[model samples]
Target chain A: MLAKRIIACLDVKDGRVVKGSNFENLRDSGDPVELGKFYSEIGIDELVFLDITASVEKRKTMLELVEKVAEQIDIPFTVGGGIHDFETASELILRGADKVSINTAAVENPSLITQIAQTFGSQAVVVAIDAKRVDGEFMVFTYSGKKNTGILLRDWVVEVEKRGAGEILLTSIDRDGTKSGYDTEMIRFVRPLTTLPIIASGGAGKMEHFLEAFLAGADAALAASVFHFREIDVRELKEYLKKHGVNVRLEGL
Target chain B: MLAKRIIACLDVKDGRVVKGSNFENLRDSGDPVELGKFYSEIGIDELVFLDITASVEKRKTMLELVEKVAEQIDIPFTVGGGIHDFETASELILRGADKVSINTAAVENPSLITQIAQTFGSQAVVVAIDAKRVDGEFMVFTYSGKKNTGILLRDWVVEVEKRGAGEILLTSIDRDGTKSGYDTEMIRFVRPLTTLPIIASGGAGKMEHFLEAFLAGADAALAASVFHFREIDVRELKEYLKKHGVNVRLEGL
Candidate 1:
């Protein structure tokens, strides 16, 4: 069986690394290249760089920052934000992103997911679903969780997989930065919908949260503040998970 | 001198509290009203709720969530995200928000800052600036930090204060979510630019960082992840700061 992966996420806005809850009041984390390299060397299974405000404006020089980060890391990395078209996705891949994640645009234009998956292979396509629990069911939100697409979470997962998305980045908006723990129920709810690898994100406060996510059937666990703030270290977290019976990749450690 | 304020920031997306780094991969934190109420009762001097995705979509339901949260807490609460007009600002205040923060709209139309300040009194207006170090100077960014305004940070602070903004929410995008420490230099550099209360934000990973930000001249220290993830409790942080010689408002604790 493939070992459960621990992924590090970087939210970049205008060439600087930042982090915040719900995408507002962003705080500077550090240099993207510097932080990316540090995480790569320290044994992060993979890295995710999201241009947080990519959709707010259109620019011709967006890929330079992506190239700078891509040049520094050896591990696989996925890039997302404001990638609304095939050309934009192609540009990101050409610039060094191994895979591209589509959020708002995918909801607005579902066919883009199929086209990208068809052209670049399913492994190169990632569908990021930002979901929130409304009433008793999980619903999809887009535009960085501002708009409720009214897309049922389970149905969306099933549709995205059927449309050729290579993997799923399932983020529980309700469990985001509270760090109480990952919404393991969110993972369990969607696990049966798709056979594709699922990356559980949001609310990673402690090592046990990662274990809980994996136990609930997430293939990978992703977190930001817990790792960025030094509250927890990647190697230490992996070791903790290993000790708890979660099979994490521990080669260099 | 006023006691240093410990402000809890809630980044809301789709009516849910969430946190993410660099504005991507948001995770569910918790219910907005529940989290806000907890912070309010736990000695948080103030509360800030940023509808992180406000600009991406124009939704009338945003105000409903604001009202829900405002009804649950009695502490001073500032609402931000896509507030570009007098009517929207008025609506938020009428719905229970004590203050309204403007970012992208303020950058797009500097006059909006003055308009809000004039309409609701300077104390009700907050100008949130997302800044990063470019070359040797700090530059202002807008649209959630995706677009650089090329406006020098020092000069912008002077202008915002002149325009009648009651407070400056200065976030050093460089130190955001890094948790290494707050950018004391950023605080010190901007302290003299404006006489208004300056809220130092970002890169607060430990209690010591809060003390440093206060010592560096920030009237209030605002953080999301550290508080949301339970890495630091507001009551304990206030006590920690008090012991460290920083005056803090410790009501309940």
Candidate 2:
């Protein structure tokens, strides 16, 4: 069995890793260069630099930041945000991103997923689906959780895999920043739907929460500001999860 | 005597080159990559990429643009806007800016001139002084001519030289785009104040306008009108200036 991956997602805004819901008021979490290396050194499986905003100018800055972070970190990492075309994804890959995650773009153009996958291979395509529970249904969301796509998680997740996405980054927008736990209803509905590796995102509060996510059938667990602040230390989380009989990488401490 | 230069000033906004007085509604002049090479191929002395807006994120994007512009254009070019700290200026220099132009930041902190000069040498710093006639006085202006400092042109120009500005980019806001000519009284007053080379900017509507500024003791006549429209072609401008007894480079073309 593959070990559960510990993923840290950096919600970047204006070229800086940021946190919070208020778009107008954002707090910079850390320098991408510094934060990337720290996570790489601590036995974290991978780092995900998520673009929170996407203006043309900001997107260009993101590429430069990606170049710098790629030069510094040793571990394989993924880059997200503003990647709507093969050119953008190829640019990120050329600049040294191990994988390119697409959310809104994938939803709008399912063909875009196959374009990147066929060119760079499906392994490089991580289709991110931001989901939320609404009217007792696990619904799909997009654009930083501001839009309702009116599609169910099962339908979109299956379609994403069919469209050639190698991995699914399922972010429960409802669980984000709550640090309560991973979404139960959402993951239960999503787990049995795909053979592609599932990276569970959102609602991680404790060390046990990661174990719960893995036991819930997530191949990997992605955390945001809580892990950024180290409420649950990555080394300790892996150690705790290892002791709990959930296979997790503990090679580098 | 050194040959007088025919300089091109590119006003960049939102990472795209723009032109006009309204600022709110400006015309897209041309892409910097294309314009830089165009000016270089036409035997223009040097290019200046000026930032029309000074947002922090836009500045980072500017650095990437600088890197690309530098890679494509064989000729040397100066980069301006949002360069206040040594770090930002140094980053631009590292990314391939031949010279760093400071306007508002220099007026706010005069030490920035010497700081860059001391680290990168005086030859790499261009102190851009925008001046306009105010009640018969040539008062210095900043922030794209929206704010005027009571300081006289002679006072600031001399102070800038003393603080180690490698060159002077002197512009007459009063005559800008008037199709009249460069400020006769302004450069005459400024010429004797500093030994640094002066690159005249603003108010060049005709071939004679550049020659007049040169006769007025400008080391270079920087033109916006010439680039926006071929009213005065760079190659023909150089050929015409050479015919008019002005020493201009005709080597590249």
Candidate 3:
């Protein structure tokens, strides 16, 4: 059986690593590459680099940055933030990217998902949904929570999956950066509904939070601040999981 | 329809980007991160960074590379070489990689293929097959061609697909660096045997090679030296294909 994955996320802005909750009030993390290598050695499963910027100029830089990272490492990496079309998606992959995550674009142009999958194959596409709870119903948001689509998060997740998204990186905006725990309900709501893999993001306060995310049927768990701030060493986290009977390989540590 | 992709492959060794064939000759390509960014701008579809080392050590440096490249570009990038387990797959993803490619390990321990796919989804797992003809029979080679698995190329491709590998990178050692053309027989043989997408590598001398590869049912055609040395620019190749009644996206260019 395949074991669950623990992923570290790097949020890059203006050529540096930064992290913030609900896309508000950012703080310095470190050099993007420096921090990425740190997590890599300690035993992380996957790495996500989110380019959190609003300008196209910044995106050009992000494009160059993706290629730089591609040359440096031989691990699976996903690029998110400000992606809008097959042009960017194709460009990024050609630049050394593996998968493209769509959120705003997925909403603006639903056909893009299936088109990308059909052209690049389903596994090369990822649909990331940023969701927040509103009046007991999960709603999708855009621009890092500036606008609520009022679209049902569960329904959209299912819709994107139907459009051939290979996986979904579902982030609970309400729980993001809280460290309270993963929004298990959010994960559970979409788990059985979609056949694609789901990555549980936001609200990972402790190691147990990861366990909760997995229990909720998330294929992988993504965390940023906890590791960026040195709150937890990823090596320790993997070791802890190993001790707890998680089937992760801990050899040569 | 999904547009065709342009991929830049970086061959790395001794903790840096190095060029060689059969792991015998080596030369510095440049800083991996810098080179990746340069290619990202040239309208490439995906970037693949191959760690052509004996094995990976100081994974921290590798991850740092991912982080740095990811920070620069917002494109799909895949990393290969020295990936052997679920942890390595996950860690690379976390370090900002989009997909991980397995070559030697997949042939050595087929189970790793399924494990990585199940944990990270099939899209995140890529099986790289290095092939060389043995008296008209394609044979799978490993350790950068230092060892032969004695497995027929057809059986190995089918096995990895059944084991849940999402994509296969079929490279011909004989054709590599020679730019003669792809081994159409190998691609044709594997095409009818498995439904999984096959990435044809090696022996890409010109635009005609790409056309031939596609006609042989390869989902994508990958060439390193031809692209690196500028035998044909991706845009020009696409235009050439379009004129030949082959479909490709070159509008932006």
Candidate 4:
């Protein structure tokens, strides 16, 4: 049985790692390559770097960063934030990134989804759906929740899958900075709808939240605040999952 | 077309990035996380952390290092050295590692290859073949080339592929430090023999050597001395590849 993955996401800008409420109050976290090596040593499963300034900067530094990270450690990596075209996606993958995440651009140009999959295998493309519950229905939003797509969450996810996305990262914008525990409802809304794997992002305050996330039907649970501050070690999370009988990779000492 | 990948290979021991030749000159490179982040920022494609001391030590720190690197950066990572059983393989994969590279253990138990493939799919496994041209034919060696496996190069490679390794990192022990160039003759003999991709390691000196490697039918050329010693930068390498007419993902500045 395939076990659920524990991922560490890095928000990179001006060549530095930063964490915040939702891309705000940005402060220097640390160096990208060094942090990558540290997490890798500790057995963090996968990594995701969001190049928050890709489009605005003409050229993406993420690819080069991907190369640098690849040079120092051996792990699967994905880059997101401002990946809007086939050129960017293919370039990132070819440069050794295992996957690329699409958000605003994917909603704006849904065909770009098909283009990325067609050019560089569907398994390499990840659709990041930022959503928030509103009026009893989860609604999709973009630009770090600055823009609302007006599209229903599940409907948008179904379209992303239909367009050949290999996986979906359904992040609850409302729960992103709250650390309240993941919005399992959002995960459930899209889980049964698409065959693709979904990474549940946002609202992970404690280990119980992760357990609850799995119970809520998330394939993988992603968190940051808990990790950055050392609230929950990755191994602890994996151990907890194993103890509870959720099929997770057991790293026996 | 898939662009050329710039892979960073790190030798880690006791949860820190260690630099050395073969396994002797151990110098603390830096914190694994810090080094990984640095490389990630520079745009290295893939990261490979080889636990050179895994077998020599009583309690190997591979799992710890894997977790640490996973937390910091975003990229595809592969782990090698002393990975013998299915449990270890699953543990690494579950932690979000994209692939595993087998060497010593594979030589001792070839069935491990088949088992890994059966359990996790072919793409998840990579076979690291450290070879030497002994009087002519490429001979497979193990234990840092201190002992001979007595396995004929061609037969073992064919058998490894049949057992399910998706890629091979053929490191020429003879040409390794020589830096004259890669073993193109050996590469030519093997490329047509198997359908799997080959990543040539050892003897990469200059930009032209990289081109020469590709011309000789290698999918990727890997060198540590140049990268570790700061003799070459990835940007320059990609630009060189672009000038040489190879399909690469170099950001146009």
Give the residue spans of candidate 2 off by over 4 A.
A19-29, B1-253
Greater DockQ among 1 and 2 belongs to 1
Ten residues in sequence with the least summed lDDT for candidate 4 chain A: A19-28
What does candidate 1's lDDT look like per residue over B94-187, in tens digits? 8888999888778768888888778778999999987766545777867654445658999999989888899999987545544568889889
Q: Is candidate 2 or candidate 3 better by TM-score?
A: 2
Judged by lDDT against the true structure, how good is candidate 3? 0.73
CA lDDT, candidate 1, residue A54: 67
Model 4 lDDT per residue over A1-253, tens place? 6578788877676555653323222233467787877777777878887664443342456767877877786777888876757887888888888899998789879988899899888988899998765445677766444333458887898899889998898887545534567887777777789878888987687888888888877877777657765678788888888899777665631
Q: Put down candidate 2 lDDT per residue, B1-253, tens digits, no spaces.
A: 7878888887676676763322222232357887677667768878888775455367777887898898898877999866767788999998899999988789989999999999999999999998766445677765444344557887898899999999999877545544568887788889888999999886677888888898899999887655665577677777888898898888867
| DockQ top scorer | 1
TM-score of chain A of 3: 0.90
Candidate 4 per-residue C-alpha lDDT over B86-117 given as tens digits, one digit per residue, 9 for 90 to 100: 88887887776678888877877888888888
Report residue B230 deviation for candidate 4 (angstroms): 60
Better of 3 and 4 by lDDT: 3
TM-score of each: 0.56, 0.49, 0.47, 0.48
Q: Which candidate is the best by lDDT?
A: 1
Residue pairs with colliding backbones in model 2 are: none
- CA-lDDT, candidates in order: 0.78, 0.77, 0.73, 0.72
State the displacement of the C-alpha of residue B236, model 3, in Å, after optimal TM-score superposition: 66
Model 4 TM-score, 2 decimals: 0.48
Report the lDDT tens digits of candidate 2 across residue range A79-170. 98657677888889888888999987898899899999998899999998987664456777654443345678879988998999999998
